[PDB]
Design a protein around this ligand. Structure first.
Ligand SMILES: [Cl-]
Ligand SMILES: [Mg+2]
Length: 233
C-alpha cells in the first residue's frame, strides 16, 4: 500500500454547529477514497448527511452517496469511507490540488477545503518502457524540466525504488555513474498526464536531486511534495 497521510481536522465542531470532520485520502487497489471521521459534538441528533465537491483540477467527485444511514447521536463518532473517482467536471484550481467541499446535515450546510495528495491519483499502469521513456523525455521541452531537493534523505536507491513502487512510481532504469545512483522513474496521473523523473543520489550529499519533466509542468511541484512525503514516511 502507498503513503496515507494521518487524518487532519477538516471541519472543527465549533465552526459547524457541532459537526467535526477529520479526514485523509487513500488509494486502495485502483480505488480512491476520502476517509473521514464525523463526530457529533452538538446536543441534537444529526441526520440527512450529504456531500459534494466544487469542480476541481483532476475532476474528483464522490462516486456514491455518503454512507451514513443512522442518526449520529450526540457524542458519537463514526468512520466513513467515501469512494471517489476522477470522472467529474474539471476546473483548474489554485493551488492545483485544492478541493472545496460542502457537507450538509439536518442542521445546516457547512464548507471547507482540503488538499489532495497527488499520489492517490497515481495510476497502476504508469510504468513506461525504457525506449518510450527516453523518447518522451527528449520530446518534452527542456524548459519543462524542474529540479527539486529531497532534503535529508539516507535511503538506498533500492529502498527508494521499493517505496516509490508502492505508490505507483516505477523505476525504469538505474545508472551507476561514479558512485552516484541515477534512478529514472515514471508515473501517470488519473488524467493521463505522464511525469518522468530523474533522482540523483550522491555519496556524502544528504540531499537528493529530483528532476521532473512533464508536458504540464505546473503539476511538478505537487509530485515533488508527495514524493518527499513518501520518502520521509
Ligand atoms: Cl451524498
Ligand atoms: Mg500499485
Amino acid at each position: 500500500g502507498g503513503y496515507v497521510a494521518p487524518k487532519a481536522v477538516w471541519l472543527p465542531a465549533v465552526k459547524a454547529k457541532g459537526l467535526e470532520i477529520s479526514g485523509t485520502f487513500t488509494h486502495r487497489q485502483g480505488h480512491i477514497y476520502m476517509e473521514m471521521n464525523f463526530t457529533n459534538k452538538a446536543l441534537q441528533h444529526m441526520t440527512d448527511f450529504a456531500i459534494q465537491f466544487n469542480k476541481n483540477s483532476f475532476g474528483v467527485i464522490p462516486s456514491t452517496p455518503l454512507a451514513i444511514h443512522t442518526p449520529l447521536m450526540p457524542n458519537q463518532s463514526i468512520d466513513v469511507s467515501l469512494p471517489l473517482n476522477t470522472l467529474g467536471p474539471v476546473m483548474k484550481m489554485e493551488p492545483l490540488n485544492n478541493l472545496q467541499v460542502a457537507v450538509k446535515n439536518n442542521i445546516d450546510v457547512f464548507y471547507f477545503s482540503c488538499l489532495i495528495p497527488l499520489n492517490v491519483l497515481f495510476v497502476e499502469d504508469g510504468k513506461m518502457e525504457r525506449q518510450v521513456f527516453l523518447a518522451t523525455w527528449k520530446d518534452i521541452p527542456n524548459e519543462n524540466e524542474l529540479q527539486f531537493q529531497i532534503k535529508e534523505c539516507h535511503l538506498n536507491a533500492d529502498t527508494v525504488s521499493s517505496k516509490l513502487q508502492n505508490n505507483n512510481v516505477y523505476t525504469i532504469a538505474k545508472r551507476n555513474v561514479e558512485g552516484q545512483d541515477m534512478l529514472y522513474q515514471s508515473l501517470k496521473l488519473t488524467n493521463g498526464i505522464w511525469i518522468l523523473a530523474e533522482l540523483r543520489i550522491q555519496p556524502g550529499n544528504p540531499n537528493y536531486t529530483l528532476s521532473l519533466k512533464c508536458r504540464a509542468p505546473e503539476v511538478s511541484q505537487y509530485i515533488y511534495q508527495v514524493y518527499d512525503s513518501i520518502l520521509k514516511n
